Symmetry: D2
Subunit: 196 residues, 4 copies
Amino acid sequence: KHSLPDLPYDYGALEPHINAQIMQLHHSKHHAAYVNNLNVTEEKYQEALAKGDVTAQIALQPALKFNGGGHINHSIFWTNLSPNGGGEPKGELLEAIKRDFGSFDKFKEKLTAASVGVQGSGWGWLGFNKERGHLQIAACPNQDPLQGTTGLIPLLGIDVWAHAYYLQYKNVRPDYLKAIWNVINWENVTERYMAC
Amino acid sequence: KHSLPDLPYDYGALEPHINAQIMQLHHSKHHAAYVNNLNVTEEKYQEALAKGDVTAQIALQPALKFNGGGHINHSIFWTNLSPNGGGEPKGELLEAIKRDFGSFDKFKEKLTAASVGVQGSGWGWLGFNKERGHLQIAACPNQDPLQGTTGLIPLLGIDVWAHAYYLQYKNVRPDYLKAIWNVINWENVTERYMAC
Amino acid sequence: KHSLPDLPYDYGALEPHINAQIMQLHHSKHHAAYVNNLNVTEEKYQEALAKGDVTAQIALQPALKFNGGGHINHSIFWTNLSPNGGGEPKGELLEAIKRDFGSFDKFKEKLTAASVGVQGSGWGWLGFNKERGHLQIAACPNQDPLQGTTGLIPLLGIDVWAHAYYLQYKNVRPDYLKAIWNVINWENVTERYMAC
Amino acid sequence: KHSLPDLPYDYGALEPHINAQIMQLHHSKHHAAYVNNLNVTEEKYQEALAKGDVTAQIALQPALKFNGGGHINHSIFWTNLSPNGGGEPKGELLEAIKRDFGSFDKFKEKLTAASVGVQGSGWGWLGFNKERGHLQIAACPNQDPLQGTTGLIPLLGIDVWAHAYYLQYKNVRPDYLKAIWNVINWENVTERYMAC
Ligand SMILES: [Mn+2]
Ligand SMILES: [Mn+2]
Ligand SMILES: [Mn+2]
Ligand SMILES: [Mn+2]
């Protein structure tokens, strides 16, 4: 069982950067749909599994990756934002940032470039590479979850699906990316980082 | 060279089914971006080709498929719609429809199911199978063009990228699909069909 | 768990078309590995599902598809071959082949083309489409199973992984394809066809 | 056009690690086919580009990637091997390997893992990342070229297509990988490394 997580703010807490209408639809509609479909897919897989039905398992697994990934991605995203967010990180996170990307600006520039460049719906990720021990930027198609498909540990995600910005910024993703920086919860990103 | 095609109507000609704001953005912004990037990609490929630079050719070819496909898909789409559209087809097209899908309703039902089911951005296609000589429904991811990636001849396309309906129907694709039936130019679809 | 099925004949029963060495390697080494790995992966997957670990499930997915498909594909393949095979089929399978492909020779020409044209490792597939009600030819990459990833019901499968012909026909697949027609078990393909 | 490069040594020069039969087949049959097909595809592509036929270009894409990559990958591979190869590298390539992987043995352990773990046909790739400035290991499906699809500059390539080891090591890739370390041309990998 999986559930739709309650936000730690209210829908309008991020205005004017991300309007309340987007936050409400994104949470109670889009994320809700992924959780519901995820639960369905996984009561189905559990019975395909019990019967040893390999064909059903494999047919199931675009559904499970899309909805399961949708749940994982959005669950992290909500925690990645805050009405008291914005600014720059401090401590080991900032030290690591300029160590792997040169500076906070270069990092910001590369993450923005990765998110805006996604063809179609997708996500832009700052991740941690456990093996190599360094920060890394990656982009995922649709709702493919970062860790499950790449191995990298997710620290910060920028959702570039049209439903995350279109009603407010239309076709101009650059404006969407430029605005979100003001509400990123660097306190949460650092927590994620330290746990690695 | 490729150019942005002039519409055969004005932006508001399809109201209330598809509002004027969507038609304007979709044409002068989204389609325009694909044509521009397409032309860039193909003056680049032409010089990669002249130098025998295989690596550059292969690096180029997500760009070319995405923007080139974007141009092809939208160019057909505009002709697929009409303010005098709607209703049902007549002649050999309707005969072929119920012959391959049972009835116009079953067909309509399956095409709607294919479009609404697309994970992420994509297109739903009624196509013609030259080899087998029958109608066929297919769905393509992002801007992958039907013929170039499937071999099927495109007859009718339903664009399910959020930029084609979100401002008006939000997350409810079913409402978007239900509305578009009233402005489909069956006269154009039949032309496409007869040419096969 | 799953099991390596016994072969319906001796390893050297398909000579000279497919030598005993290949049959022995293909069955007792390759197919056995898929079963063993399939079981290890399923056990795994059962643990991830119990804990609701979506990430573990999504990460497990390529291992399960590859091994699950390996087991499925090969299990069908063994029954598709016979020392008393060869020639053409009779009954309605034959009429269906005429109806959907023109003639038996056109069918084998197209199934051979789909098999030889597989880039890298893969399978050429005669299948049945329940939706349309007709036979259809498809090719699958590596060990992706026909039904699970396509919806088509498998009738006859041709394995074009190098481990199925390289020792005997080297770089020449056409020679392999040409030879295999002599050991096709049409009785089995007919049974599979009458079942759906 | 493109050309099948001559081999820097005789076909039996890598014995007993890679027998003459494989080397002869791999070079004069497989690589030659990629070059020939690459040239036919390019000529083609030149015609489609002249006419501005986007559909023909997009349809041509898998043929060109597969053959173009085949030619690129194999051309690098021949220079990566030598009768006087084997042992370890010296100079800064060695320090870079220590710095980015810990030790030479950890590097070969990881490059071997990436190569043996390739599902189906593919390549294991040592590469250099110009953006980050460090060595990196990557695996590519079938004939997809490293640079063109990844951005990484190729230094050392290990071919795991069955046609590169099956005749000699059958189903056991680890034996093949274990053997190949004896003929690696570190002089060439060093030159490729110093160039970028
Ligand atoms: Mn989202
Ligand atoms: Mn569109
Ligand atoms: Mn096989
Ligand atoms: Mn090779």
